[PDB]
Write a protein that binds this ligand. Structure first.
Ligand SMILES: [Ca+2]
Lengths: 48, 973
């Protein structure tokens, strides 16, 4: 929530549900990187 | 360097030779004497320039009145028929049979969707429509992304089915009606006569985005003029996709504003500032809207939010009253995402009395609070909209005209007045039209006061088109010279009728395209703007025309004779001519009609040929096979009779015209007998001239073609071998040289074009013209123009016989008023005959402009076509320059010091023509050149509107204003 909190301000209509905006939505976005499922796309949003 | 006296004698002999050749070979005097020797085949009638304006104004008022009477009928029937509608919700067994336009015409589809049943029409072909129409039923247009079969749409298609008989009876009561349309608040548009839509949905590759609820006529007849103040939110939280949707939404919202509405775009993030260079409500015309859009597309998002600052700024912008406003609807549009401050303080401090509405748009997919925004919305009589994607923008940024229309409904029968739109281009390709609208009210249970919940909104708007070819027929312009004309005016400046209003859209700025960001199959949208061309932007602008304009905008009659610069047909010259503007108001409506007559045009010629033998004898002369005895004959494509139509292939037209005038007796039952009598009398006169004079000296030394262009379309070019070298228009009222040589009282040289593909330098020759001018009863007349094409070679050799061909001691050129090269002395100049002189000797030309021999005027053309820049064609503004003689003194001697050197020059104007002989030290002497002085349409973007709004043109506004009725509901948000 500090690193990528509110930084997903992309100017396209692509949807990104696994983001770190609030606590209930950062917990879900961390649990998914922990179960190693589609975690490589949560990294490309964090890098872009 | 030769002295002044020898040069004066040179130009004296040169001018004398030129003038005597033109006078003795064209035949001015002989045509004058034969125009004066008859005096019995015709009569001289006066143009009472006041009676004409009154008659034309009454004809226009009567036409618009007949179009009004066909609107209140439609609206009455629509209100009555919808009042008695029962709202069924099961349409399976009872099909709704109708003709959905933009459906396929192959007769083996048989769609018959659930609840609906189509029709296969017959589609005869028509005139007054450039397409195929069916007078049996009305067509329906349903926007692409609106399902046809929704119970809301199938109900409109039910109770609108009873409009078709009133459509039919209106049409058969007045067979010259164009489209009648009912455009309803559910997207539908039912128009008559039926005709397939121009863009089917996906049967072609392209999409149609036409929503009857965004059209100018609908948005006009659905509310009253506004004072909008779009208050964008550029806080940090709107960054991302919300900001993009806010930009697109503000643009699509501006596209719903007309020229009577005033608008400004603020922007707040812990500080409220304007978004552009304006700082107060501006008039929302095409240029101001372009400025606002280009400034909104640069918005960036960063900071904290503060609604109190933004609303203080908005409410303080809506209280200026130092500027011109619409003074009717004060609304604030807040484009935001979500917040927590509702700020009751500011709404109590500024609109405790609720004069300013608030519409709040919450944009994007976010997780913020919207309670405060809905509260602001439906606390201040406003409304609340949600815009989550690009697809909902077009539908949410147009639906506030349901809120703004409540007072117009609670006003009732007082609020039903027909009002006419700006000039715009028809959506079914009819050209330029104006549409008259009248709203339709929903009255269910009106004698017992039952619901009044759906009965606050209108149903739709009823409109009916009036083409501008319908108005240009009530102002017939063929008893005036090529120079006089009618023109009308809005109570806004904008022009409704003019000789300089073209069917193209009004251009803004400089066109820029990025070809490298457009997929080949994406179907870009095109345009929606009206053709709003101000009156001062169609002509040249004195400060006496500003006076006439501001005097006829407020419905005054009068007359004014003065002297003005007039720009020739081809935008290359300028003439100081006298004019007489006589104007009057059109009583029924808010237009004003003026007539421009040049003195020498207060009398015209009326044919009186009644001895049918003379008629037949004259009509014999315009037959192709005897051209070798009378010269190539062109005939202007005017509508003499109902049957034949202008052909654009003048041989086709001359053949049809001859076979017509002999195919029907001279009785003339259905023919415009005055036009035809004049044309035949004219042909007789011209043929007598050609036979008695041009036939005797079959060939002269310098002449190449001797022609006569007159009133009645008759154009005669003597050697048919020169008839193939006539690039002029056959309609003599569009011949640039004709209108030019009517103004001047002497000979006029028309410098040919340069580097344009065609026979233009040596095969054709240089054109010289003079206007025949006769006195019948002490009354001036200028009925014809006689001319000559001078051979370039004979002129060169008479020019040389100290100037020698390809000399290098000096240069000796001949230019005209306009600075175009005619006869040079260097064989490389002479190669480029017809080019602007400032393009082949820029230093001398700038100096000439400086020493005040050549004055110049600059203007803008707002409907031009250009190749887009880098940042098929687009529409563009082109600046046009035009040079002319200002000082009437002849000789000008001097010397230009072009830096460390100086070349001496002497210029002398050949009197009795428009020619100027220049003799200068050679250009090889001084190796100086600043830069070319181009006279051509240079694509520009000015004037800067950031400065025109500080001191705008005069304008009057509509005085009916329906806002703030106190029995409203406003329990909606
Ligand atoms: Ca996986």
């Amino acid at each position: 929530m500090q690193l990528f909190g509110g930084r997903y301000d992309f100017e396209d209509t692509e949807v990104r549900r696994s983001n770190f905006d609030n606590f209930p939505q950062a917990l879900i976005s961390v649990f998914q990187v922990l179960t190693g499922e589609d975690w490589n796309s949560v990294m490309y949003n964090g890098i872009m | 360097f030769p002295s002044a006296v020898t040069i004066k004698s040179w130009v004296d002999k040169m001018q004398e030779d030129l003038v005597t050749l033109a006078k003795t070979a064209s035949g001015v005097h002989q045509l004058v004497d034969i125009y004066e020797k008859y005096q019995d085949l015709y009569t001289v009638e006066p143009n009472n320039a006041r009676q004409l304006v009154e008659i034309a104004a009454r004809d226009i008022e009567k036409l618009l009145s007949n179009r009004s009477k066909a609107l209140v009928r439609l609206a009455l029937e629509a209100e009555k028929v919808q009042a008695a509608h029962q709202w069924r919700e099961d349409f399976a067994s009872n099909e709704v049979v109708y003709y959905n336009a933009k459906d396929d015409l192959d007769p083996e589809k048989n769609d018959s969707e659930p609840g609906s049943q189509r029709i296969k029409p017959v589609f005869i072909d028509d005139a007054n429509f450039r397409r195929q129409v069916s007078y049996q039923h009305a067509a329906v247009h349903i926007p692409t992304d609106i399902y046809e079969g929704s119970t809301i749409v199938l109900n409109e298609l039910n109770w609108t089915s009873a409009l078709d008989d009133v459509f039919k009876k209106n049409r058969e009561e007045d067979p010259s009606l164009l489209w009648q349309v009912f455009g309803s608040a559910t997207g539908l548009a039912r128009y008559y006569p039926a005709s397939p839509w121009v863009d089917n949905s996906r049967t072609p590759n392209k999409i149609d985005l036409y929503d009857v609820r965004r059209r100018p006529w609908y948005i006009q007849g659905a509310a009253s003029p506004k004072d909008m103040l779009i208050l964008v939110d550029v806080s940090g939280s709107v960054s991302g996709l919300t900001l993009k949707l806010i930009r697109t939404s503000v643009s699509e919202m501006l596209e719903t504003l007309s020229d009577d509405d005033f608008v400004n775009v603020a922007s707040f993030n812990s500080n409220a500032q304007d978004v552009s260079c304006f700082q107060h409500l501006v008039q929302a015309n095409v240029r101001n809207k372009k400025v606002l859009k280009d400034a909104v597309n640069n918005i960036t998002a960063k900071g904290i939010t503060d609604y109190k600052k933004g609303f203080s700024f908005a409410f303080e912008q809506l209280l200026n009253y130092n500027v011109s406003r619409a003074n009717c609807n004060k609304i604030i549009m807040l484009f935001t995402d979500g917040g927590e401050e509702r700020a009751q303080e500011i709404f109590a401090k500024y609109n405790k009395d609720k004069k300013v509405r608030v519409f709040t748009f919450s944009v994007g997919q976010h997780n913020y609070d919207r309670g405060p925004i809905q509260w602001m919305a439906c606390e201040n009589k406003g409304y609340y909209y949600e815009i989550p994607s690009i697809g909902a923008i077009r539908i949410n940024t147009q639906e506030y005209l349901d809120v703004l229309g409540r007072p117009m409904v609670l006003a009732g029968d007082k609020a039903k007045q027909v009002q006419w739109t700006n000039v715009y281009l028809d959506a079914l390709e009819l050209g330029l039209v104006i549409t008259g609208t009248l709203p339709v009210f929903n009255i269910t249970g009106q004698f017992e006061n039952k619901t009044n919940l759906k009965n606050q909104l209108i149903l739709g708007v009823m409109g009916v088109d009036v083409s501008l070819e319908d108005i240009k027929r009530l102002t017939p312009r063929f008893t005036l010279c090529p120079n006089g004309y009618y023109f009308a005016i809005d109570p806004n400046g904008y022009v409704l009728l003019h000789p300089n209003l073209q069917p193209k859209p009004i251009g803004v700025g400089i066109p820029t395209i990025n070809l490298r960001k457009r997929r080949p199959n994406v179907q870009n949208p095109k345009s929606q703007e009206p053709v709003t061309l101000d009156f001062l932007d169609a002509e040249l602008e004195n400060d006496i025309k500003v006076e006439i304009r501001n005097k006829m905008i407020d419905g005054e009659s009068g007359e004014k004779t003065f002297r003005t610069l007039v720009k020739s047909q081809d935008e290359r010259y300028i003439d100081k001519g006298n004019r007489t503007y006589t104007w009057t108001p059109v009583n029924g409506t808010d237009y004003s009609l003026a007539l421009v007559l040049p003195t020498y045009s207060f009398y015209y010629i009326k044919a009186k040929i009644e001895e049918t033998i003379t008629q037949a004898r004259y009509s014999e002369t315009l037959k192709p096979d005897n051209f070798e005895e009378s010269g190539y004959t062109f005939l202007a494509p005017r509508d003499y009779c109902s049957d034949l139509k202008p052909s654009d292939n003048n041989t086709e037209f001359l053949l049809n015209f001859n076979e017509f005038i002999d195919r029907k007796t001279p009785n003339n039952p259905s023919c415009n007998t005055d036009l035809i009598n004049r044309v035949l009398l004219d042909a007789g006169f011209t043929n007598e001239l050609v036979q008695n004079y041009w036939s005797k000296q079959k060939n002269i030394k310098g002449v190449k073609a001797r022609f006569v262009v007159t009133d009645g379309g008759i154009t005669r070019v003597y050697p048919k071998e020169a008839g193939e070298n006539w690039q002029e228009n056959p309609e003599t009222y569009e011949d640039s040289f004709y209108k030019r040589s009517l103004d001047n009282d002497n000979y006029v040289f028309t410098a040919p074009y340069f580097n344009k593909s065609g026979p233009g330098a040596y095969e054709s020759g240089i054109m010289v013209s003079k206007a025949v001018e006769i006195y019948i009863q002490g009354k001036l007349l200028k009925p014809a123009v006689v001319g000559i094409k001078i051979d370039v070679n004979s002129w060169i050799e008479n020019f040389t016989k100290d100037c020698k061909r390809n000399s290098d001691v000096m240069d000796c050129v001949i230019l005209d008023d306009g600075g175009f090269l005619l006869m040079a002395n260097h064989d490389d100049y002479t190669n480029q005959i017809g080019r602007f002189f400032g393009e082949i000797d820029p230093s001398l030309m700038r100096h000439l402009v400086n020493i005040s021999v050549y004055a110049f005027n600059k203007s803008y053309d707002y409907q031009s076509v250009c190749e887009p820049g880098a940042a098929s064609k687009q529409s563009c503004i082109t600046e046009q320059t035009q040079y002319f003689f200002d000082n009437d003194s002849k000789s000008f001697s001097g010397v230009l010091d072009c830096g460390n050197c100086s070349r001496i020059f002497h210029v002398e104007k050949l009197m009795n023509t428009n020619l100027i002989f220049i003799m200068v030290e050679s250009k090889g002497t001084c190796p100086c050149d600043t830069r070319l002085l181009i006279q051509a349409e240079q694509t520009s973007d000015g004037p800067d509107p950031c400065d025109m709004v500080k001191q705008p043109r005069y304008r009057k506004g509509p005085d009916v204003c329906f806002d703030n009725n106190v029995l409203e509901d406003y329990t909606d948000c």
